[PDB]
Amino acid sequence: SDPVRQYLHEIGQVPLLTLEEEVELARKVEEGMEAIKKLSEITGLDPDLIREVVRAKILGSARVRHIPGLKETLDPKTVEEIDQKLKSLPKEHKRYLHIAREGEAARQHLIEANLRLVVSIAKKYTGRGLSFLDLIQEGNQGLIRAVEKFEYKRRFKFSTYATWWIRQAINRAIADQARTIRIPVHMVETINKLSRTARQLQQELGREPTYEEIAEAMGPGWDAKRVEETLKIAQEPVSLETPIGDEKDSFYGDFIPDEHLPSPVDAATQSLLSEELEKALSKLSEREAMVLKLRKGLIDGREHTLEEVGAFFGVTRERIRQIENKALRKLKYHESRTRKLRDFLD
C-alpha cells in the first residue's frame, strides 16, 4: 500500500549473510569469472557472449533480451544452440560450465543478501532532488558494481568495499538527473563548492557575502564576474503552473505572452510588404526586377556574391552587378512617388 514499507519487507526476507557465507559466495563468483575466460579459450566464442548465456539459464527464461554489446541477438535459440556446443565438452573442460553456473548463482544471493546496506546509505541522501526509492535503485545499481569487483582474498568484510560503489552511484544520479536542465557532473561539482564556501563566509560575516568576497575565498582564477555567471546557470527553472494568489484560479504561466508566433498586426504587416514590394518590381522593369529579383529572394533569398550571378542571368557577370545598381537605382527614384515604403522601417 506504501511503496517503501513494501520494499523494506521483500528485503527483510533474504537473511543477512554470515562471515563464511560472505566468503563462500564471494569465492564462488571470482572462480566463475575465471571459469568463463578459461571457458572461452577452450571454445574461443567470447567472454561476454558466454557470460550472458551462463546468466540466461541460471536466472530462468523469465527474462531474455539481445544484450547490446554482444554481437548476436540473444534469442533462446542461440541459448540452446550455445548451451549445446558448451555442454558438448569433456568432463575436464565442461567442468567449467558447472563452475560458471554455480558462480552466477552466488552473484544473485550476494546482491539480494546485501540490499539492507544500500537502504541505510541512501537513507542519508534524501531531500536532494531524488526520491528515496530512486536513490535506492541508484544505490543498488552500484552494489551490482561492488560484487563484480570484489576481492575476498583481501580479507575485507563485503560491507566495507560496497559502501563505496553505493555512495558513488547515489552521488552520480543526484548529480545527473536531479535538474530539469541537466548540467555536466563536474560543473555541478564546483557549484556546490560555492554553496559551501559562501556558507562559511556568511557564517563568519554576520551577513551574506558579495560576489567579490566569494571570488577571494574561492582563490585564483576566480574573479567577481565568474562567480556571477556561475550562479546564473545554477538557476533552476520555475513551474509554469506555479500558483498565483491564495485562492488558486490563476497560473503564473498565463501571465506569459507567446512571442514566437507572429501577432496579427505582425503577420498582416509581412503581407503588405512582400506585395507592396512586388508593387515596385514590375512598375519600372520586370526583367531587371528579375535579375535583381534573384540577387535576393521573394521567399528563400538568393544572395552569394559573384558565382551563380555569373551562371544563368542572360548577361555577363559584372554586368548584372550594374543593372543591380540600376535595379536599385530605379527603385530609389521609383520610391520617390509611391513613398509608401518608408513606413516599414517604423
Binding site: 562471515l19 566468503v23 536466472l59 555442454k87 568432463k91 558447472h98 553456473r101
Partner: protein, 291 residues
C-alpha cells in the same frame, strides 16, 4: 494450482524454488546426524537443534576435519601356548587368548621405547641407533610397564597380560603367522588400523572433499587464501566432517554419478529426464538441478 490464481511471494518460492530451512548449532556442539543424510521432521539434529521439515540434510561449514589415516604393518607378540586361541586372523573386538594368571610379556631385543598408545591397546617399538629393531603389539588386556623414550635390555618385562585379552575395535588382524618354541608361541600379525588427526578449517577456508573420500599422499583437503595454512593429505586415509557452522535441511533428492554429467546447474526438470552417466541415472521428482 489453477490458471489465474493468486499466490503470495512465499507461496511462489515454494512452488518455484523449493522448501528448505537452515539451523545453527551452538558453536562446537556436534551433529547428531551427518552429511548426505536423509531425515524427517521432528528428528533431533543437535543437542538444542531439531529439524521441522523433511529432506536431505547438508553440511555448511565443518570447523573440524578428521582424517582417519590407514596403516598396514607387521608387529609381534609372544604368549603361552595353553592360553591363546588358534585363529588365522582376528576380527576387531575379537578375543584371541585367555591367561590362567598374569604373564609378563618381556623384550626380545635391546633398545629404547617408542610407545604409541591407541584408543584401546598399544604399540611398542624398540629401536637402537635410530633403525627400528622390533615392533611389539600389546592388545587389550595387556597393560604397558614402560614409558615413551625408555631403555630395555633383552628379556625385561614390557607389559603384563591379565585374564582375557582381545583385539581392539579400530584394529584388524589381516593374517596371523604363528611359530612355537618353548611352552609359548610368538605371533607376527599383519595388523591393520587407522589413526585420527583433527584439522582446523577457518572462516576464510573451505573443505574441498566430500564426507568419506579416499586420499593418497599429496591430496588437498582444504583450501585457503595463502598457500600456507592449506591442509594437504599427508598420506593415505579417508575424510570425516564434524562440527559444522550450521546445517541446511533442504527438501530435495540426491543422485550420485560416476562419469561426465549431462545437466549443468540451474536447469529445471521433471521425472524421467536424463541427469548424467550416459542415460543410467535420471530424474525422480519435478525439480531444479544443483550439480
Amino acid at each position: 494450482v489453477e490458471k489465474r490464481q493468486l499466490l503470495t511471494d512465499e507461496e511462489y518460492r515454494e512452488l518455484r524454488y523449493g522448501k528448505q530451512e537452515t539451523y545453527p548449532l551452538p558453536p562446537g556442539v556436534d551433529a547428531l546426524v551427518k552429511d548426505g543424510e536423509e531425515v524427517v521432521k521432528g528428528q533431533e539434529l543437535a543437542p538444542g537443534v531439531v529439524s521441522r521439515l523433511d529432506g536431505v540434510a547438508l553440511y555448511r561449514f565443518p570447523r573440524r576435519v578428521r582424517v582417519e589415516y590407514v596403516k598396514k604393518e607387521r608387529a609381534g607378540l609372544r604368549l603361552p601356548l595353553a592360553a591363546w586361541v588358534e585363529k588365522e586372523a582376528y576380527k576387531p573386538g575379537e578375543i584371541l587368548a585367555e591367561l590362567p594368571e598374569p604373564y609378563l610379556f618381556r623384550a626380545e631385543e635391546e633398545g629404547v621405547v617408542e610407545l604409541k598408545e591407541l584408543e584401546e591397546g598399544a604399540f611398542l617399538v624398540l629401536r637402537r641407533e635410530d633403525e627400528p629393531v622390533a615392533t611389539y603389539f600389546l592388545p587389550v588386556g595387556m597393560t604397558p610397564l614402560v614409558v615413551h623414550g625408555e631403555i630395555v635390555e633383552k628379556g625385561q618385562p614390557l607389559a603384563e597380560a591379565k585374564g582375557l585379552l582381545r583385539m581392539p575395535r579400530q584394529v584388524r588382524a589381516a593374517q596371523v603367522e604363528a611359530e612355537e618354541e618353548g611352552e609359548t608361541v610368538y605371533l607376527t600379525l599383519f595388523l591393520e588400523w587407522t589413526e585420527p588427526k583433527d584439522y582446523r578449517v577457518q572462516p576464510h577456508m573451505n573443505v574441498v572433499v566430500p564426507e568419506g573420500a579416499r586420499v593418497e599422499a599429496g591430496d588437498k583437503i582444504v583450501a585457503a587464501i595463502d598457500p600456507e595454512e592449506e591442509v594437504i593429505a599427508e598420506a593415505e586415509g579417508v575424510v570425516h566432517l564434524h562440527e559444522p557452522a550450521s546445517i541446511l535441511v533442504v527438501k530435495a533428492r540426491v543422485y550420485p554419478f560416476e562419469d561426465d554429467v549431462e545437466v549443468s546447474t540451474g536447469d529445471r526438470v521433471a521425472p524421467g529426464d536424463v541427469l548424467a552417466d550416459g542415460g543410467k541415472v535420471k530424474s525422480d521428482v519435478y525439480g531444479r538441478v544443483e550439480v
